[PDB]
Amino acid sequence: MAEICLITGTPGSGKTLKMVSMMANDEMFKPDENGIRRKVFTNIKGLKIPHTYIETDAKKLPKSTDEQLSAHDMYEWIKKPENIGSIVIVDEAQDVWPARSAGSKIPENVQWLNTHRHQGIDIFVLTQGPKLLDQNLRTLVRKHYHIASNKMGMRTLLEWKICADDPVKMASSAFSSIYTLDKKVYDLYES
């Protein structure tokens, strides 16, 4: 069933290309027995794979309309039939689900996350560091990849089964693999 996956790493570490590489290869993105792919909502620009754009800048669009979708009232439109079982990929996710004060009221656009499996929604959130995100979103993460670089830029993909709040410091509990891409990744993406 549906899960929430976190991808972190500094700008230019290759988070978006890894994401597109996954979309190009991973089972959840393939067409079903009827030739139908799961609907993809994303804010990633230059993505060639069919998707629906979501606005993450609340000043630009704080609410959805019958014409454009805001990430900010996802709790509303995500529950509608045409959108069940969809996949949501939010780049720079701190724009939608930032860290919040301890014991403050939990917003509607966060409250629904803990029941995201009901709507069968897979969610990927990319950001530069886990602590930019709502703890209430982080608690739900069941796969965390972090791209680490050794500064002769050898990149390692670190993987945990929960959100690692301090990824480089927690690398010893990660599964480490060489950072890898689909060689056709640019057929699907332009930055």
In this structure, what are the phi and psi dihedrals at residue 157, rounded to the nearest 5 degrees? -90, 120
The answer to whether 191 and 154 are in contact (CB under 8 A) is no
Sign of the C-alpha dihedral, residues 27, 31, 34, 39? positive
Instruction: Check residue 71 and give left, alpha or beta (phi > 0: left; psi -120 to 50: alpha).
Output: alpha
In this structure, what are the phi and psi dihedrals at residue 168, rounded to the nearest 5 degrees? -65, -50
Assign domain 2-191 to its CATH superfamily.
P-loop containing nucleotide triphosphate hydrolases (3.40.50.300)
Pairing assessment for the beta strands 141-149 and 155-160 based on DSSP bridges: antiparallel
Mind spelling out the 3-state secondary structure of the chain? CCCEEEEECCCCCCHHHHHHHHHHHCHHHCCCCCCCCCCEEECCCCECCCCEEEECCCCCCCCCCCCCEEHHHHHHHCCCHHHCCCEEEECCHHHCCECCCCCCCCCHHHHHHHHCCCCCCEEEEEECCHHHECHHHHCCEEEEEEEEECCCCCEEEEEECCCCCCCCCCHHHCEEEECCCCCCHHHCECC
Give the N- to C-terminal CA distance of the chain in Å, as an integer.
Answer: 31
Question: Among 88, 45, 87, which residue's Cα sits nearest to residue 189?
Answer: 45
Given strand 122-127, what is the order of strands in its sheet?
Answer: 69-70, 52-55, 40-42, 87-90, 122-127, 4-8, 141-149, 155-160, 175-178
User: Where do the domains of the chain lie?
Assistant: 2-191
- Residues 60 and 100: their CA atoms lie apart, in Å, by 21
- Residues 159 and 76: their CA atoms lie apart, in Å, by 32
- Residues 6 and 26: their CA atoms lie apart, in Å, by 16
- Residues 96 and 90: their CA atoms lie apart, in Å, by 8
- Residues 130 and 183: their CA atoms lie apart, in Å, by 28
Token pair 């609907």 in the structure block, residue: 39
